[PDB]
PDB file of C-alpha atoms in Angstrom:
ATOM      1  CA  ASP A   1      94.770  92.735 119.131  1.00  0.00           C
ATOM      2  CA  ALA A   2      94.737  96.137 117.432  1.00  0.00           C
ATOM      3  CA  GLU A   3      91.608  97.934 116.225  1.00  0.00           C
ATOM      4  CA  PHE A   4      91.382  99.556 112.792  1.00  0.00           C
ATOM      5  CA  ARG A   5      87.909 101.106 112.837  1.00  0.00           C
ATOM      6  CA  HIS A   6      86.120 102.663 115.813  1.00  0.00           C
ATOM      7  CA  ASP A   7      82.796 103.490 114.159  1.00  0.00           C
ATOM      8  CA  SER A   8      79.987 101.925 112.126  1.00  0.00           C
ATOM      9  CA  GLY A   9      79.856 102.122 108.342  1.00  0.00           C
ATOM     10  CA  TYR A  10      76.930 100.720 106.372  1.00  0.00           C
ATOM     11  CA  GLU A  11      74.471  97.823 106.198  1.00  0.00           C
ATOM     12  CA  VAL A  12      76.369  96.486 103.185  1.00  0.00           C
ATOM     13  CA  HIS A  13      77.152  92.867 104.051  1.00  0.00           C
ATOM     14  CA  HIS A  14      79.725  92.788 101.249  1.00  0.00           C
ATOM     15  CA  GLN A  15      82.008  94.694 103.620  1.00  0.00           C
ATOM     16  CA  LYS A  16      81.951  91.625 105.867  1.00  0.00           C
ATOM     17  CA  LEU A  17      85.298  90.814 104.251  1.00  0.00           C
ATOM     18  CA  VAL A  18      86.713  93.388 106.669  1.00  0.00           C
ATOM     19  CA  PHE A  19      86.798  90.510 109.154  1.00  0.00           C
ATOM     20  CA  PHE A  20      90.239  89.774 107.708  1.00  0.00           C
ATOM     21  CA  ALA A  21      91.439  92.693 109.830  1.00  0.00           C
ATOM     22  CA  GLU A  22      89.201  91.913 112.804  1.00  0.00           C
ATOM     23  CA  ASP A  23      90.629  88.396 113.053  1.00  0.00           C
ATOM     24  CA  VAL A  24      93.921  89.654 114.482  1.00  0.00           C
ATOM     25  CA  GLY A  25      93.691  87.391 117.514  1.00  0.00           C
ATOM     26  CA  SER A  26      93.790  83.598 117.655  1.00  0.00           C
ATOM     27  CA  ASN A  27      91.556  81.466 119.874  1.00  0.00           C
ATOM     28  CA  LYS A  28      93.311  79.028 122.209  1.00  0.00           C
ATOM     29  CA  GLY A  29      90.796  76.202 121.946  1.00  0.00           C
ATOM     30  CA  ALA A  30      87.577  76.175 119.934  1.00  0.00           C
ATOM     31  CA  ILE A  31      87.094  72.406 119.789  1.00  0.00           C
ATOM     32  CA  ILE A  32      83.566  73.075 121.039  1.00  0.00           C
ATOM     33  CA  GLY A  33      82.792  75.174 117.979  1.00  0.00           C
ATOM     34  CA  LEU A  34      82.229  73.020 114.904  1.00  0.00           C
ATOM     35  CA  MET A  35      82.289  76.132 112.718  1.00  0.00           C
ATOM     36  CA  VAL A  36      83.463  79.743 112.942  1.00  0.00           C
ATOM     37  CA  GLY A  37      81.450  82.865 112.184  1.00  0.00           C
ATOM     38  CA  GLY A  38      84.385  84.045 110.108  1.00  0.00           C
ATOM     39  CA  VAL A  39      83.174  81.861 107.246  1.00  0.00           C
ATOM     40  CA  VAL A  40      79.569  81.410 108.369  1.00  0.00           C
TER      41      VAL A  40
END
């Protein structure tokens, strides 16, 4: 659960890939969620 960036960047959605670093934590139970925003 460590942050890498503490400030906005740009509207470029292509940077969405940054999620790879934002997904440092792991949910305990997401059975309720059919899909995850990580891919959607």
